[PDB]
Symmetry: C2
Subunit: 112 residues, 2 copies
């Protein structure tokens, strides 16, 4: 899921880590000879953006439809013992709903 900016307690470890890190990046680039530190966090918000990794192990069959034909209404698996083909695969899909997207991060397949 997703969740627009919301106030966070300054005690939250995540905020502590984020603060240090930023005060880190700051001293690393500040035009001063002296190291600076947080005097006061006046405001602290967080937003959680998320994703789902799906791992599906799947068995596939060869159908009758063709990669040419648009009519993918119905495609039985094959009839005759010599046209039927079959593969096993471990797909790994990275989705992130609201962004409306999917990625076949990794696909491993064995034919037999």
């Amino acid at each position: 899921l997703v969740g627009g900016p919301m106030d966070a307690s300054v005690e939250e470890e995540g905020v502590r880590r984020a603060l240090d890190f930023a005060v880190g990046e700051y001293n690393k680039a500040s035009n001063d000879m002296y190291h600076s530190r947080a005097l006061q966090v006046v405001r602290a918000r967080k937003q959680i953006v998320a994703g789902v990794n799906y791992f599906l192990d799947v068995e596939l069959g060869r159908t009758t439809c063709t990669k040419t034909q648009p009519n993918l209404d119905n495609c039985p698996f094959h009839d005759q013992p010599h046209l039927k083909r079959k593969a096993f695969c471990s797909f790994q899909i990275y989705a992130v709903p609201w962004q409306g997207t999917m990625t076949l991060s990794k696909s491993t397949c064995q034919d037999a």
Copy 2:
């Protein structure tokens, strides 16, 4: 959400698995040596997992300490007590964090010397 957890088994009834499946079979056919379309004969196992990414927006007033940047020991860094040396600064940092991968980067920052 769950920042970082192991992968658990989902029900093969989930819309999410259902789609993730139809999607991979889709890419799968796209790349298969075969003039023929192929479909799931069966989904033998199906686990999911959740990558979480937290964005942080911190509003910070920074002060100038007594320690020097080229200093080894940084355990004691007082704020400047001498008027002509006191130096302040206001910023807004946006930090992106993927707890699992254990990383943070400064998406952006703005500071106004004050």
